[PDB]
Design a protein around this ligand. Sequence first.
Ligand SMILES: Nc1nc2c(ncn2[C@@H]2O[C@H](COP(=O)(O)OP(=O)(O)O)[C@@H](O)[C@H]2O)c(=O)[nH]1
Lengths: 345, 285
Amino acid sequence: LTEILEAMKHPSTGVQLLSEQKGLSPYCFISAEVVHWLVNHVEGIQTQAMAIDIMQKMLEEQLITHASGEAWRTFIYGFYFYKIVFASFQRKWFEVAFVAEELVHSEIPAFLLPWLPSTVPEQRTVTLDVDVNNRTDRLEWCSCYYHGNFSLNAAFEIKLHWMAVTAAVLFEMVQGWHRKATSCGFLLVPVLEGPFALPSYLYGDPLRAQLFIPLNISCLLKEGSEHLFDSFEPETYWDRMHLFQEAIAHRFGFVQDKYSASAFNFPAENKPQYIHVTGTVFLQLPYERVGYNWAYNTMLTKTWRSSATGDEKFADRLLKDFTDFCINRDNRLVTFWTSCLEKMH
Amino acid sequence: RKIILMGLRRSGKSSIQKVVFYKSVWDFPGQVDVFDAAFDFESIFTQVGALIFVIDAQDDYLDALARLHVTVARVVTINPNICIEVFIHKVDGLSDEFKIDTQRDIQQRTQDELADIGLENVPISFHLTSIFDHSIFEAFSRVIQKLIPQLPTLENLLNIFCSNSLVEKAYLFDVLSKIYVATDSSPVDVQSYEICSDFIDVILDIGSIYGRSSQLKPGHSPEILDETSSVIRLSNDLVLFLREMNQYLALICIVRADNFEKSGLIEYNVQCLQTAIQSIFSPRT
Ligand SMILES: Nc1nc2c(ncn2[C@@H]2O[C@H](COP(=O)(O)OP(=O)(O)O)[C@@H](O)[C@H]2O)c(=O)[nH]1
C-alpha cells in the first residue's frame, strides 16, 4: 500500500530506481530488485509469493504500473520495467521473466518418486540498434529473438537475424555481450542451430551426422525383468526413463536447451536437447535402442574459449568418459544406480 | 616514491629486474596478493606512484586480468594518484602479425572492463616489453616519465634546443641504467635508440679502463675533472655526441654532419641547457 511505496521511494537506502536513460520514464525500476528489497526491508513477509501478491495489490490500485502504460498485465517477477504513478516498448527493451522453479525437496529422485509431478510468451523479439559508437554513417538494425523466461538450470538463448547490418559492428556488440557475460558469471558462446538435423533439412549439414552412445540398462535390471521401472506404473515408465536419462545428463554437466521450433507443430517429432556448461557438446535424447545422440558444437572457436570452456581436447575426454559411464565400465553406472536405490529408504 | 612490479607466476618480472635493474624497483611475487594480509599493502601503496602489471602474451591472461582489475580497485581505494601501466611481455618469439592482434585483444578486453567496473577516471597505459630487446628500457622510461613532475619543462627545453640547434633527436639518459629521463617531441626510432644505448656502453667501458689516475680518489680530487664529452661521426651523414650533464645524467643528440659544421653553436646551446638542467635539479627554496 501507500506507506510501502513511501518506504520504497526513500532517497538514502530505498530502491535503485533507474536514471534518465533515453526511452525510459522517470521513477522506473526493475521488478526483481524491488522483489528482493521487499523480502528484506518489509513489515513482515518472508517468501517471494506474498511479495508478488503485495506487488500485485499495488498494481491493482494503480500505485505502480508498467513503463509502457500497458495497464492490463499482472506483476511479472524478473527483468520487467515498472514505474511509479504499447507494443513499441516491447521491440526496444529486453524483458526476461524469472521462473521460480521449486528446488528438489524430495531426496528420492524424480524417476523413483511414487507419484510424478506432471501469460508471458516463450520467445520475445526486440529490434536492436547495432551501431552504438556511430562507426557507420548509415542506419543498421537487427532483430533479436530471445527467451521470455529465465531458469538457473536452463540455457538462455539469443538469436540474431539481420540483413542491413555491417557484420563487424555486430561482432563488436556480440564481443561486448560476451565480455559482460564473462564478468557477470555466465558464458555466452555461439552454438549450432540445427545440431541433430538431417542433411535434407533446412538447418542440417550434408557432411554432419550424430554419434550414438548406447546406455547399458540391461546390467541395471534385476533378476528376471525386462522393464527398469516395472514396480511403478508402465504408462509413465518411459517418462521415468527420460528423467533417469536426464539424471545422468545432470551428472556430466548438461543443461537443458529449450530450443524454439521454427513454426513446427506435432510435438512427437522434436526431441529434447541438452547443452554442456562449456558449450562444447550437444546432447539429444532420442525416441528402442536406449542411448544418447552426441553432437559437437563446431561454432565454438578459439576466440570464444576461456577457462570456463576448457581446452580444445575437453570434448574428446568428455566423450571418452561418457562412453565409459554409459557402457558400465568398472561398475560405475551401478554405483550411480544403486545409490539412487539408497535414496529409496 | 617506489615502483612495484606486479604480475603472476612465470610472467617475466625477475628477468626484467635481471636485465634492467641488475644490468626503488620492488618485485612483489605472483602469489600472496592484496587479499592476503602478509604485508601492509595500504601503507606501501600510499607511497607508491607507479604500479606495473606484467601480462604474458603467450599464456592465458584472464585470471591475470581479474587479478589486475582487483589490484587496480585496491590501489584506487588506497590512493587516487597512482599510475597504472600494463607490461605485455615475452614478445620475442612472436611474429609481427601476432603482436598487433595481441595488443588489440588485450586493450579491448581491458578498457571495456574498466568501464564495467566504473573507474574510468584513472589512466591505464599498455606497453610491449621483451627482455631480449630494448623495448623494456623504453617502457620503463615511459613509466619513469610519469613519476617525474618536471617532465614538460625538460621536454619543452629539449624541443626548443632541437629546433634552435638543428638537432634531429635528443635524449636525457641516466648512464647507470640506460633509461632516458626526457626526450623531444619527435618519435623514438629503435635503430636510433640501440646506438644511443650502446654509445653509453662504449663511453663507460673506455672511461672505466683509462680513468684510473685520480677519478676515484677516496678523499677528494685535487683538480676538478672535465665533464665526459664524446663525438662519433658515422658514414651515413649522422653524428652522435654526448655531454655529461650531472653526476648521473647525460645528453646524447643525433645531428647531421651538414649541421655539425657549426658545432660551436650546438656546444654553446648544450652549455646553456646544462645551466638550465643544473638550475632545475638544484635544491631551492
Ligand atoms: N625466451 C624468453 N624467456 C622469457 C622472457 N621473459 C621471461 N622469460 C622466462 O620466463 C621466466 C619468468 O620468471 P619470473 O616470472 O620472472 O619469476 P618470478 O619473478 O620469481 O615470478 C623467466 O625465468 C624467464 O626465463 C622472454 O622475453 N623471452
